[PDB]
């Protein structure tokens, strides 16, 4: 079984696209492999230097992933900056990185040195742990390939010291029909207040269809989100309500509201428990950092032989 | 009230007479009334070479050489760069405050790109690391060479950026360009590049070769010799006090001794002058753990200041 490593964005608020799209699958994969996952809070600094906001974002990211089912016993789960080894490997990988490689990168292309450089720091996270597989999206594919390129450059020079990582890649619709995404501001958040959740579900864009008539559920965003929360029978019963007529889109929102609350009630409660007693969160994160620091310290020793430390 | 002076010492190359009468003696003598921080810059060395076995022994040799020439771990803070790891982290942080054009215009990179050669990310980024070195220790003065000053200006710009954003986090550092030239074997200023050096930590054989290579006029053995023009006399002056040097020109202006003999004299002068350094040098490498203890001590003092500084930083970045 291959080593799968995921960096996790601390920034922002987790939404149900994230959940049914990435996380749920990842949480169910914790049995067939030792997963490694980290809140990349180092990368978070390229786009912000408000410390207090960054700090909170990390605690909150931490708690959110745990409550959605990351089990720190099965997997290796930690805060990036807790394993400082990556920082020194970053420096070493830089010496093997041609500028051109970075100039042609895409999050920069598409301007601080942090922003230009972060692909090397990413290669360091990947390479430090002999990652076989990096689960990403299209947007992050060439970052993985850049780490693989750095790896080949180092191997040629030092012998095979690094595993060559390989990138691995059904849409949740957002509020407006598009892919749900923070950047489109069309999301339904998981850890928000009931009041905020009702507002988000209210913004869902609908047909003009009149309350009295049959509504098309095949093209209704409300029905598409709801599909995520129901089996075939619950989906049939709501389809029958669309067709029958006599209920408005507003009635369906109330229903989606209750579906979304019920579904995440536990994760929400666990989240709040984690943030009310943060000494437990720290402990979970410290425990994950220990397992990762042990793998990292051991790769580093081998690097140190090659680089003379 | 002695302001903090910080100097990065390159681990590569062989130290020579010029390195000593030129820069090192002054640094060693500054220790008493100055507050000196000096580190062996082994992270920077990594941009030039990735050959670990060489890099390690250059680092050791370097540390042993400076200690030998008079760096006092008790008066000073002296350490190997890589022993104080906070510096890597500060390097990441400063990158967030470092504008690209500030690096695209750095000489080292510019000039590399001009020749037509390709550049590592390391080469491009080293100015930020350098700036982390400077700023991590609240450096007041960075002793610098006539062309190296851009480095300090870069740190100074990053410093302002961060302070603008977070308040008084950094002391703004200042280049101090240092103040007689040491003649090389060929008459030109002695430097590694010119291959005109007389090394300090060499065999008796290698010293003799280098000294014997010194170039001279064809003033015959028996005839008076113009000291005021001889390179042997120029160099010999560095090892000799007032009476010592006059005693010697008397030998020149009397005739009777030839340059071959003066070269023999010069050998004994250099050998004697550096004997205690050379023997100290050899012990530190032969008994690697006395060296280690001293570099650990140094690293311990540097690390305390770096930690007090990273504590401030951690507050502001949320770590």
Swiss-Prot record, chain A:
<comment type="function">
    <text>Catalyzes the attachment of tryptophan to tRNA(Trp).</text>
</comment>
<comment type="similarity">
    <text>Belongs to the class-I aminoacyl-tRNA synthetase family.</text>
</comment>
<dbReference type="Pfam" id="PF00579">
    <property type="entry name" value="tRNA-synt_1b"/>
</dbReference>
<dbReference type="InterPro" id="IPR002305">
    <property type="entry name" value="aa-tRNA-synth_Ic"/>
</dbReference>
<comment type="subunit">
    <text>Homodimer.</text>
</comment>
<dbReference type="InterPro" id="IPR050203">
    <property type="entry name" value="Trp-tRNA_synthetase"/>
</dbReference>
<feature type="binding site">
    <location>
        <position position="172"/>
    </location>
    <ligand>
        <name>ATP</name>
    </ligand>
</feature>
<keyword id="KW-0436">Ligase</keyword>
<protein>
    <recommendedName>
        <fullName>Tryptophan--tRNA ligase</fullName>
        <ecNumber>6.1.1.2</ecNumber>
    </recommendedName>
</protein>
<dbReference type="GO" id="GO:0004830">
    <property type="term" value="F:tryptophan-tRNA ligase activity"/>
</dbReference>
<feature type="short sequence motif" description="'HIGH' region">
    <location>
        <begin position="10"/>
        <end position="18"/>
    </location>
</feature>
<dbReference type="InterPro" id="IPR002306">
    <property type="entry name" value="Trp-tRNA-ligase"/>
</dbReference>
<dbReference type="GO" id="GO:0006436">
    <property type="term" value="P:tryptophanyl-tRNA aminoacylation"/>
</dbReference>
<keyword id="KW-0963">Cytoplasm</keyword>
<feature type="binding site">
    <location>
        <begin position="137"/>
        <end position="139"/>
    </location>
    <ligand>
        <name>ATP</name>
    </ligand>
</feature>
<keyword id="KW-0648">Protein biosynthesis</keyword>
<feature type="binding site">
    <location>
        <begin position="17"/>
        <end position="18"/>
    </location>
    <ligand>
        <name>ATP</name>
    </ligand>
</feature>
<dbReference type="InterPro" id="IPR024109">
    <property type="entry name" value="Trp-tRNA-ligase_bac-type"/>
</dbReference>
<dbReference type="InterPro" id="IPR014729">
    <property type="entry name" value="Rossmann-like_a/b/a_fold"/>
</dbReference>
<feature type="binding site">
    <location>
        <begin position="179"/>
        <end position="183"/>
    </location>
    <ligand>
        <name>ATP</name>
    </ligand>
</feature>
<keyword id="KW-0547">Nucleotide-binding</keyword>
<feature type="binding site">
    <location>
        <begin position="9"/>
        <end position="11"/>
    </location>
    <ligand>
        <name>ATP</name>
    </ligand>
</feature>
Curated annotation (Swiss-Prot), chain B:
<feature type="binding site">
    <location>
        <begin position="145"/>
        <end position="147"/>
    </location>
    <ligand>
        <name>ATP</name>
    </ligand>
</feature>
<feature type="binding site">
    <location>
        <begin position="18"/>
        <end position="19"/>
    </location>
    <ligand>
        <name>ATP</name>
    </ligand>
</feature>
<keyword id="KW-0436">Ligase</keyword>
<feature type="binding site">
    <location>
        <position position="133"/>
    </location>
    <ligand>
        <name>L-tryptophan</name>
    </ligand>
</feature>
<dbReference type="InterPro" id="IPR050203">
    <property type="entry name" value="Trp-tRNA_synthetase"/>
</dbReference>
<feature type="binding site">
    <location>
        <begin position="10"/>
        <end position="12"/>
    </location>
    <ligand>
        <name>ATP</name>
    </ligand>
</feature>
<keyword id="KW-0648">Protein biosynthesis</keyword>
<comment type="similarity">
    <text>Belongs to the class-I aminoacyl-tRNA synthetase family.</text>
</comment>
<keyword id="KW-0030">Aminoacyl-tRNA synthetase</keyword>
<feature type="binding site">
    <location>
        <position position="182"/>
    </location>
    <ligand>
        <name>ATP</name>
    </ligand>
</feature>
<keyword id="KW-0547">Nucleotide-binding</keyword>
<dbReference type="Pfam" id="PF00579">
    <property type="entry name" value="tRNA-synt_1b"/>
</dbReference>
<comment type="subunit">
    <text>Homodimer.</text>
</comment>
<keyword id="KW-0067">ATP-binding</keyword>
<dbReference type="GO" id="GO:0005829">
    <property type="term" value="C:cytosol"/>
</dbReference>
<comment type="function">
    <text>Catalyzes the attachment of tryptophan to tRNA(Trp).</text>
</comment>
<dbReference type="InterPro" id="IPR024109">
    <property type="entry name" value="Trp-tRNA-ligase_bac-type"/>
</dbReference>
<dbReference type="GO" id="GO:0004830">
    <property type="term" value="F:tryptophan-tRNA ligase activity"/>
</dbReference>
<feature type="short sequence motif" description="'HIGH' region">
    <location>
        <begin position="11"/>
        <end position="19"/>
    </location>
</feature>
<keyword id="KW-0963">Cytoplasm</keyword>
<feature type="short sequence motif" description="'KMSKS' region">
    <location>
        <begin position="189"/>
        <end position="193"/>
    </location>
</feature>
<dbReference type="InterPro" id="IPR002305">
    <property type="entry name" value="aa-tRNA-synth_Ic"/>
</dbReference>
């Amino acid at each position: 079984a291959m080593r799968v490593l995921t960096g996790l964005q601390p920034s922002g608020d987790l939404h149900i696209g994230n959940y049914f799209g990435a996380i749920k699958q990842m949480v169910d994969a914790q049995e067939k492999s030792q997963m490694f996952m980290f809140i990349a809070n180092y990368h978070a600094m390229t786009s912000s230097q408000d410390g207090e906001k960054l700090k909170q974002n990390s605690l909150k990211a931490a708690a959110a992933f745990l409550s959605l089912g990351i089990d720190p016993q099965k997997s290796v789960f930690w805060l990036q900056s807790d394993v400082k080894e990556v920082m020194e490997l970053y420096w070493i990988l830089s010496q093997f990185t041609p500028m051109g490689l970075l100039e042609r990168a895409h999050s920069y292309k598409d301007a601080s040195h942090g922003l230009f450089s972060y692909p090397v720091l990413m290669a360091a996270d990947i390479l430090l742990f002999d990652t076989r597989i990096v689960p990403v999206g299209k947007d992050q594919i060439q970052h993985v390939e850049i780490a693989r390129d750095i790896a080949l450059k180092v191997n040629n020079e030092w012998g095979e010291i690094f595993t060559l990582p390989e990138a691995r890649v059904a849409v949740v619709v957002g509020t407006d029909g598009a892919k749900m995404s923070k950047s489109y501001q069309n999301t339904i958040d998981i850890f928000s207040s009931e009041k905020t959740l009702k507002k988000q579900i209210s913004s869902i864009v609908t047909d003009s269809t009149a309350l009295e008539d049959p509504k098309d559920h095949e093209n209704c965003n409300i029905f598409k989100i709801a599909k995520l929360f129901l089996d075939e029978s619950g989906q049939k019963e709501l389809q029958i309500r669309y067709e029958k007529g006599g209920e408005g889109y507003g009635h369906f929102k109330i229903y989606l509201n209750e579906l979304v609350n019920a579904y995440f009630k536990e994760a929400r409660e666990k989240y709040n428990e984690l943030l009310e007693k943060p000494s437990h969160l720290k402990e979970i994160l410290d425990f994950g950092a220990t397992k990762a620091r042990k793998i990292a310290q051991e790769k580093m020793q081998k690097i140190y032989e090659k680089i003379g430390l």
